[PDB]
Amino acid sequence: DFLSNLQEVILGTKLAILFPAIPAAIICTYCGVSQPWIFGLSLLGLTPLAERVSFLTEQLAFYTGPTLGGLLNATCGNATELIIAILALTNNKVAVVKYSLLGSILSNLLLVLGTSLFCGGIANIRREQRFDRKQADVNFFLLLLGFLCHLLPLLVGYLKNGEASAAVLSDMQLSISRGFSIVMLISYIAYLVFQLWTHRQLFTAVISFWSGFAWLVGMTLVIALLSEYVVATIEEASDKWNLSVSFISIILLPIVGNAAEHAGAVIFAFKNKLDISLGVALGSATQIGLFVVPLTIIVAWILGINMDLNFGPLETGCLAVSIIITAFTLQDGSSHYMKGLVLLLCYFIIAICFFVDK
Amino acid sequence: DFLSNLQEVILGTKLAILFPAIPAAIICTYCGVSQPWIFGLSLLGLTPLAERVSFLTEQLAFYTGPTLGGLLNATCGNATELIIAILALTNNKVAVVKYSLLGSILSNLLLVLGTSLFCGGIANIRREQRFDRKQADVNFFLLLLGFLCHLLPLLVGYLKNGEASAAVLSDMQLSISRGFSIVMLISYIAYLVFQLWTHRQLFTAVISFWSGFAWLVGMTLVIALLSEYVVATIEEASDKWNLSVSFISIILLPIVGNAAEHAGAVIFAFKNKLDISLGVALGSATQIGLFVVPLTIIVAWILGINMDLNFGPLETGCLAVSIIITAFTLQDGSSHYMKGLVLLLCYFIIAICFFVDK
Amino acid sequence: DFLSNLQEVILGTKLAILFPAIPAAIICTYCGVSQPWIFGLSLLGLTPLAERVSFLTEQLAFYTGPTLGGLLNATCGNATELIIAILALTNNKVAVVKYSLLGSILSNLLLVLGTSLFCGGIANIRREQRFDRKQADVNFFLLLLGFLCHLLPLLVGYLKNGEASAAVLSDMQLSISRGFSIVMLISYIAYLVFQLWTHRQLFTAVISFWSGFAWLVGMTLVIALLSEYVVATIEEASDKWNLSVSFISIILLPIVGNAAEHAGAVIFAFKNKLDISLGVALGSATQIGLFVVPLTIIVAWILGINMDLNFGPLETGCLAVSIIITAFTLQDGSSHYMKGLVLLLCYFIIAICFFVDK
Ligand SMILES: [Ca+2]
Ligand SMILES: [Ca+2]
Ligand SMILES: [Ca+2]
């Protein structure tokens, strides 16, 4: 395309002061800079690269067809939650995998969704704001299937009364979590048939094709380079800031991940198209909940690393109410600003409980 | 009727190879056959007898009237869950009573209901499939009254902190469970007035009358003969198969019980009448939940046998999500196949958690 | 007004035999009467004074305007739950504050609401009974925000496994409860703008003005005089009746408090206006849940008294099901008598569990 949209669209992001963070993460590695600065200049280097992957992926959709063009249009908003989950599972920091994959479900149900209803409720306060229910009820049937897979290994850990030690109940949680994962991958392959082929009918570009595959390695081998620096240097970056590792992982780190889905769900909220702001905010809390999370169990199954679906007692109660307050909000096909301020303030309640949790 | 429908309708079951299991359970008793074979040839002998009672009971409805013909039409699908619960309560195997009466609630909410939506969604994928909400909302108000009676004696067992030993909190669970049962029998007598008399309007035969009372003892004193053999020989039949007694009782045994309600809820799903497949699958999880279960407490109250509504922590969390995922599925009066595959896969999640639970 | 409605309207209460209980509480103080009688003649002295405040407050609404006349019309039904909560927090009986503010949420969701549907369902059984959903969905979004603030300090108390003693986890519950309260007062100030100003349009008197301020001190300094006698003499009045202090506080004491809201929600149920019986029964379980309860934490924050949002395990499970069975009842805008009998019998289940709880 003769180097024209290769310089303008790269400088055509609504956030573009974050591009000099990328040279100040490799150079600061080979100079002996202390580890909080490498952590500060790696989150600010993945924030436009989480968008430039999740925008240029749509540019390859117009060169494939109707089948794959319904798949890659709705599967690569989560190409940063996947790389950080695998470059922390192989580094044996298994707890950070359980928080960043939980904070990407809560941010897509409370902060992303409850800003499309608030900011796109005040601008359109003198119009009627309608979406459809049948298009986004399937996204809540699957999250209640995911919650049952997280509830049951939690309650097995509190069965120490029943004449069993810890070595029995730990290989009982680990056996049923490695069997719930195959059941969770089947209710997402079936979802990717209902959404694409069977019920499609009830449901131009600017860039050349050869550009779209060159950059989507040049914007992926830089996410995989910086996702090591976030994982391998999160401990000293949690002792010089006086923050907990169960707050950086669950609150600050999903903001870098879900920043592509958080300017697409808001711009289509000012345009009064809330069918689209519910496809981005809900259809990406299902890909995390039922394809990205049970795939980590299967990769741990192969590598010999122990990992089960036990998040914890305080993390599961936040997951249970996030699905119930979202379901009762979206059950009549009409919205206003007070539906979205209740979802924001339920996210400032979770964000206090982990700021104190030391 | 001159021995004509007495030989044709008896041979007129869609499952009729299970009739020679009945002679091979009495003869194998008086020959010293080892106890797994008596257990194998007793479940296969109760499967057509759970249907021939729950079909010939409708034949007596056309000889009584409108009042009783709305009662016996909807009260004797559960004439096998009642005999096995009483022929195990008097044999002091109280735990098997708590599993088989729970696995008859889960099978009617997930496996019976989620097959009428899946098998009757693929055949009618090119039509619109509608039921009514007001006819089956009362069935969920009562199950939330039943769940509160099971939640509260569970949480009293975890109040050992409050300066009370086990002998105090065991006669505190036992006192409130014997008072919740009278409150549960009143919200089912009131349901049998709302359904029959007060709101009836908003809601031929082939066999003679004298045939219909002869067989309905000859098909009931054979259920009561074989329900002893299932109860008194479940222990050695759980050591020669390497299965748990909390899997045989909760999964394999309700399949023999709910096999009359599992070919009537499916044939009316191919006929695109989902008002009727929701009256069989939901109106029989309410008779178990609010008439068969609180009647066992009252019979234990009279016989001096200690029994309360405490199922357990792992069994109550499966009961809580089964009511919530069923309520959010049925709240718009329209169905398709993906609503029923989520209910089947939530039953293959419960069936793993108890296959491992040794 | 020349002493005419000052004698007729004071004698114009539908309960007026309870007025001689007021002289028999001050005289019995200065005569050495034993403390159960002062407790018996103080609940019967606050029952017409909980009504005469919550009726004459509407008489001052017609002398202020549209703004304040939407506020005092809906903020002083709870002028007795507030005085008893503060005259027990300063007397260091902190547990009674946690029960009487819980039994005012349960009575407004089950006993007040489930009598407007039952008594106003039998009188209007031959008509169709409709309310609106959008007017009373906001009242359930806020109660799910209140429940998350009560769920999370409960689960922190069961984190004694995580290498922390009791002195760590008690100043961890106390820190997050004093930060959840500011988040709860903001989602009620925002509710008092949505209800009054922004969405008003989608949503004579008999007494002079100068009468309305004289009596509303003369009916408030008698509530504050008798609310000391209920608090300071509840212990011996729970040893001469053989009742628990977690039954008098949660069942018998809210009946005196919610007796103004329990003849206004019933008379508008016989008149077939269920938009109004849902504004009294639901809009007063939100003022308790999100303005009266988080204000007690802030007053305890200033006075140096330790108080957090931890009610208990058995009290939170009763709060969780009370919101779920109320939400599934009111989701179609139509009512009948069987919706209200299920809500009454769920209140006779809570009232047994605390009658035994000694
Ligand atoms: Ca993302
Ligand atoms: Ca049955
Ligand atoms: Ca009140």
Domains of chain C, earliest start first: 33-353 (1.20.1420.30)
Q: Which two tokens stand for residue B162?
A: 């409050």
- SS3 of A136, please? coil
C-alpha–C-alpha distance, residues B123 and A91, integer Å = 50
Give chain C positions within 8 Å (CB) of B151: 317, 321
Of C134, C140, C103, the closest CA to residue C245 belongs to: C103
C-alpha–C-alpha distance, residues B108 and B22, integer Å = 26
C-alpha–C-alpha distance, residues A164 and A111, integer Å = 42
Q: What does B38-84 look like in DSSP terms, one character per residue? A: HHHHHHHHHTTHHHHHHHHHHHTGGGT-TTGGGTGGGT-S-TTHHHH
Q: Is B281 on the interface with C (CB under 8 A)?
A: no
Which residues have C-beta under 5 Å from ligand 2, the single-atom ion? B 77-78, 257-258
Give chain A positions within 8 Å (CB) of B356: 172, 175-176, 179
Sign of CA dihedral A296, A298, A304, A309: positive
C-alpha–C-alpha distance, residues A18 and A44, integer Å = 6
- HEC string of C207-259 equals CCHHHHHHHHHHCCCCHHHHHHHHHHCCCHHHCCCCCCHHHHHHHHHHHHHCC
Q: Which two tokens stand for residue B228?
A: 């002893």
Q: Which two tokens stand for residue C44?
A: 């019967």
C-alpha–C-alpha distance, residues C352 and C358, integer Å = 12
Q: What does A19-34 look like in DSSP terms, one character per residue? A: GGGTHHHHTTTTTT--
The ligand whose atoms approach the alpha carbon of B223 most closely is 2
Work out the angle at residue B222's Cα, subtended by the Cα atoms of residues B221 and B226, and round it to the nearest 5 degrees: 120
Give chain B positions within 8 Å (CB) of A183: 345, 348-349, 352
CA C223 to chain centre: 15
The ligand whose atoms approach the alpha carbon of A79 most closely is 1
C-alpha–C-alpha distance, residues B49 and B57, integer Å = 12
C-alpha–C-alpha distance, residues B148 and B146, integer Å = 6
C-alpha–C-alpha distance, residues C36 and C233, integer Å = 7
- HEC string of chain C equals CCCCHHHHCCCCCCCCCCHHHCHHHHCCCCCCCCHHHHHHHHHHHHCCHHHHHHHHHHHCHHHCCCCHHHCHHHCCCCCCHHHHHHHHHCCCCHHHHHHHCCHHHHHHHHHCHHHHCCHHHHCCCCCCCCCCCCCCCHHHHHHHHHHHHHHHHHHHCCCCCCCCCHHHHHHHHHHHHHHHHHHHHHHHHCHHHHHHHHCCCCCCCCCCHHHHHHHHHHCCCCHHHHHHHHHHCCCHHHCCCCCCHHHHHHHHHHHHHCCCCCCHHHHHHHCCCCCCHHHHHCCCHHHHHHHHHHHHHHHHHHHCCCCCCCCCHHHHHHHHHHHHHHHHHCCCCCCCCHHHHHHHHCHHHHHHHCCCCC
Are residues C332 and B199, on separate chains, in Cβ contact within 8 Å? no
**Do residues B333 and B130 touch, judged by C-beta distance below 8 A?**
yes
Burial label for A273, CB within 10 Å (0-12, 13-18, 19+), is middle
CA B108 to chain centre: 7
Q: How far is CA A232 from CA A70, A96, B10, B87, B144, in A?
A: 36, 11, 73, 62, 48
Q: How far is CA A318 from CA A96, A105, A108, A250, C247, in A?
A: 17, 11, 13, 12, 31
C-alpha–C-alpha distance, residues A4 and A14, integer Å = 18
C-alpha–C-alpha distance, residues C296 and C114, integer Å = 28
* Chain length of chain A: 358
CA of C82 to the centre of ligand 3 (A): 9
**Nearest-neighbour CA in chain B from C320: distance (Å):** 10
**Do residues A333 and A131 touch, judged by C-beta distance below 8 A?**
yes
Are residues B159 and C313, on separate chains, in Cβ contact within 8 Å? yes
**Do residues A112 and A340 touch, judged by C-beta distance below 8 A?**
no
The ligand whose atoms approach the alpha carbon of A258 most closely is 1
C-alpha–C-alpha distance, residues B195 and C338, integer Å = 10
Q: Is A338 on the interface with C (CB under 8 A)?
A: yes
Of A263, A322, A307, the closest CA to residue A102 belongs to: A322
- HEC string of A61-125 equals HHHCCCCHHHCHHHCCCCCCHHHHHHHHHCCCCHHHHHHHCCHHHHHHHHHCHHHHCCHHHHCCC
Q: How far is CA C143 from CA A258, A335, B152, C285, C322, in A?
A: 28, 19, 21, 8, 10
Residue that is written with structure tokens 């029989």 in the block: B284
C-alpha–C-alpha distance, residues A35 and A240, integer Å = 9
Work out the angle at residue A20's Cα, subtended by the Cα atoms of residues A18 and A25, and round it to the nearest 5 degrees: 105
C-alpha–C-alpha distance, residues C254 and C232, integer Å = 17
Q: Which two tokens stand for residue C251?
A: 């069942």
In angstroms, how far is the first alpha carbon of chain C from the final one?
53
Are residues B342 and A159, on separate chains, in Cβ contact within 8 Å? no
DSSP class of residue A332 equals S
Longest dimension (CA), chain C: 72
Q: Is C144 on the interface with A (CB under 8 A)?
A: yes
C-alpha–C-alpha distance, residues A255 and C312, integer Å = 34
DSSP class of residue A240 equals S
**Nearest-neighbour CA in chain C from B141: distance (Å):** 7
Of B32, B26, B51, the closest CA to residue B259 belongs to: B51
**Nearest-neighbour CA in chain B from A312: distance (Å):** 16
Q: How far is CA A288 from CA A181, A254, A294, B46, B349, in A?
A: 13, 12, 9, 45, 19
The amino acid at residue B76 is: C
Give chain A positions within 8 Å (CB) of B346: 144-145, 148
Q: Which two tokens stand for residue C126?
A: 């031959």
Are residues A183 and B349, on separate chains, in Cβ contact within 8 Å? yes
C-alpha–C-alpha distance, residues C222 and A181, integer Å = 64
Q: Which two tokens stand for residue A345?
A: 């303030």
Give chain B positions within 8 Å (CB) of A327: 328
Residue B102 phi, psi dihedral angles, 5° rounding: -90, -40
C-alpha–C-alpha distance, residues B224 and B235, integer Å = 19
C-alpha–C-alpha distance, residues A41 and A45, integer Å = 6
CA of A81 to the centre of ligand 1 (A): 6
Subunits adjacent to chain C (3 or more Cβ pairs under 8 Å):
A, B
| Resolution for this experimental structure (Å) | 3.2
Give chain C positions within 8 Å (CB) of A352: 176, 179-180, 183
Q: How does B304-325 read in b/e, with b if 16+ C-beta sit within 10 Å?
A: eeebbbbbbbbbbbbbbbbbbb
C-alpha–C-alpha distance, residues B321 and A285, integer Å = 19
- Residue C147's contacts (CB-CB under 8 Å, 6 or more residues apart) are A321, C319, C320, C323
Q: Which uninterrupted H or E stretch holds A142?
A: helix A138-156
Q: Is B158 on the interface with C (CB under 8 A)?
A: yes
Residue that is written with structure tokens 């700021």 in the block: A355
**Do residues B274 and B114 touch, judged by C-beta distance below 8 A?**
no
Of C86, C67, C303, the closest CA to residue C193 belongs to: C67
Subunits adjacent to chain B (3 or more Cβ pairs under 8 Å):
A, C
Work out the angle at residue B244's Cα, subtended by the Cα atoms of residues B240 and B250, and round it to the nearest 5 degrees: 125
Give chain B positions within 8 Å (CB) of A162: none
Q: How does B56-78 read in b/e, with b if 16+ C-beta sit within 10 Å?
A: bbbbbbeeeeeeebbeebbbbbb
Are residues C137 and A356, on separate chains, in Cβ contact within 8 Å? no
Give chain A positions within 8 Å (CB) of B341: 187, 190
**Do residues C255 and C51 touch, judged by C-beta distance below 8 A?**
no
Torsion (CA) B138, B142, B144, B149 in degrees, nearest 10: 170
The amino acid at residue B330 is: L
Q: Is C327 on the interface with A (CB under 8 A)?
A: yes
C-alpha–C-alpha distance, residues C133 and C274, integer Å = 11
Q: Which two tokens stand for residue B207?
A: 């066999």
C-alpha–C-alpha distance, residues C265 and C277, integer Å = 4
C-alpha–C-alpha distance, residues C84 and C74, integer Å = 20
**Do residues C103 and C253 touch, judged by C-beta distance below 8 A?**
yes
Q: Which two tokens stand for residue C354?
A: 């605390």
Q: Which two tokens stand for residue B84?
A: 């096995």
C-alpha–C-alpha distance, residues A83 and A81, integer Å = 6
Q: Which two tokens stand for residue B223?
A: 């259920």
- Residue C70's contacts (CB-CB under 8 Å, 6 or more residues apart) are C195, C196, C200
- Residue A100's contacts (CB-CB under 8 Å, 6 or more residues apart) are A81, A84, A85, A88, A249, A250, A253, A254, A257
* Chain length of chain C: 358
Residue that is written with structure tokens 């392959």 in the block: A189
Of B315, B317, B291, B275, the closest CA to residue B135 belongs to: B275
Q: How far is CA B237 from CA B19, B39, B245, C17, in A?
A: 22, 7, 9, 70
How many other CB atoms sit within 10 Å of the CB of residue B183?
Answer: 19
CA C335 to chain centre: 24
Give chain C positions within 8 Å (CB) of B144: 321, 324-325, 328, 342, 346
The amino acid at residue C29 is: T
Q: Which two tokens stand for residue A144?
A: 């209640």
Q: How far is CA C76 from CA C50, C105, C228, in A?
A: 10, 16, 20
Residue that is written with structure tokens 């357990």 in the block: B312
Are residues C187 and A325, on separate chains, in Cβ contact within 8 Å? no
Alpha helices in A164-312 (DSSP H): 166-189, 191-193, 209-218, 223-232, 245-247, 253-257, 264-270, 277-281, 285-287, 293-303
C-alpha–C-alpha distance, residues C115 and C255, integer Å = 14
C-alpha–C-alpha distance, residues A115 and A130, integer Å = 16
How many other CB atoms sit within 10 Å of the CB of residue A26?
Answer: 16
C-alpha–C-alpha distance, residues C173 and C152, integer Å = 9
CA of C128 to the centre of ligand 3 (A): 30
C-alpha–C-alpha distance, residues B294 and B101, integer Å = 11
DSSP class of residue B236 equals G
User: Radius of gyration of chain B from Cα atoms?
Assistant: 21
C-alpha–C-alpha distance, residues B44 and B256, integer Å = 8
Which residues have C-beta under 5 Å from ligand 1, the single-atom ion? A 77-78, 257-258
CA of A182 to the centre of ligand 1 (A): 23
Experimental approach: cryo-EM
Q: How far is CA A6 from CA A13, A57, A58, C38, in A?
A: 12, 15, 16, 86
DSSP class of residue B192 equals H
Minimum CA–CA partner of B193 in chain C: C338
Of C217, C251, C188, C178, the closest CA to residue C56 belongs to: C217
Minimum CA–CA partner of A176 in chain B: B353
Of C311, C278, C277, the closest CA to residue C293 belongs to: C311
Q: Which two tokens stand for residue A60?
A: 């390859």
Sign of CA dihedral A41, A47, A50, A52: negative
Helices (H) and strands (E) in chain B, counts: 23, 0
Residue that is written with structure tokens 């007062």 in the block: C185
Are residues B152 and C313, on separate chains, in Cβ contact within 8 Å? no
C-alpha–C-alpha distance, residues A288 and C14, integer Å = 60
Burial label for C303, CB within 10 Å (0-12, 13-18, 19+), is exposed
C-alpha–C-alpha distance, residues B221 and B112, integer Å = 27
Q: Which two tokens stand for residue C201?
A: 């349009």
